[PDB]
Design a protein around this ligand. Sequence first.
Ligand SMILES: CCCCCCCCCCCCCC(=O)O
Length: 288
Amino acid sequence: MKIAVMTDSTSYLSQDLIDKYNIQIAPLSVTFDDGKNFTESNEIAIEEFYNKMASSQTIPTTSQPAIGEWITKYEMLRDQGYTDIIVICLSSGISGSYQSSYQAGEMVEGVNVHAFDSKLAAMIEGCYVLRAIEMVEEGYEPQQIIDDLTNMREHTGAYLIVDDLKNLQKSGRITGAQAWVGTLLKMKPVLKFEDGKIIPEEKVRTKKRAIQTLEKKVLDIVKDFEEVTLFVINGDHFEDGQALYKKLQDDCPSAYQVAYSEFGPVVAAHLGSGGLGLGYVGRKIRLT
Ligand SMILES: CCCCCCCCCCCCCC(=O)O
């Protein structure tokens, strides 16, 4: 038995970790109104993506990996000698990536594919990859890993803010948010993931109070966990995520793991400018 762990690009793992563990990635893409298509990777300058989105008369669209991209990656790993492939996917509630990766796995001969629905995105999805890799090194078998990731999923989540719901409304990735869209004053929406979908949580009077609300909501949840990893997941306002990261480092005991990450282009296209997430996992994830 020889187990590989792979993922799609929206896990937004650092290039350092992708390099160290040779993590294969099925990339998603974003298409601009001028017909320019860009596949996700860590060579794309995120600042350049935000500049093009700002200069776009129409919001860019995104695309999951094609089923043939999964198949090509599975065939490559099989032919290097892997017998089993763990696949960590973006939430099935917001993308067809997961179901595609499962159907691709059914079609590929000579290798076992174990597709896993993270029910989240960004480095929270990425934590499932890092957990799976750790378990493979410890000698676990694929079904034990899948069982452990399924348990991890029960104590994982995220809250987030955006400047405006127009990007999420345009793509249909905000669930049950009709009355707020285009009806906000200074008030800022706080959103959260629930069972793989993005739903409203609270409306707050200002952005600064919304960032305070992210911290309060998450700290109230994770105080009941035996282990805690928090991720600040920042969008285009560097100082917003950096401020929250530093405040978490002050407010939290060192027994909590507190880390910083950023959204890539595909998630940015759906959030728009001003996105900022606080994610949590009730595990001590190996981040090195
Ligand atoms: C804190 C994590 C926040 C993640 C925000 C995710 C916003 C929705 C992204 C949807 C990507 C769909 C990709 C596709 O299938 O085309």
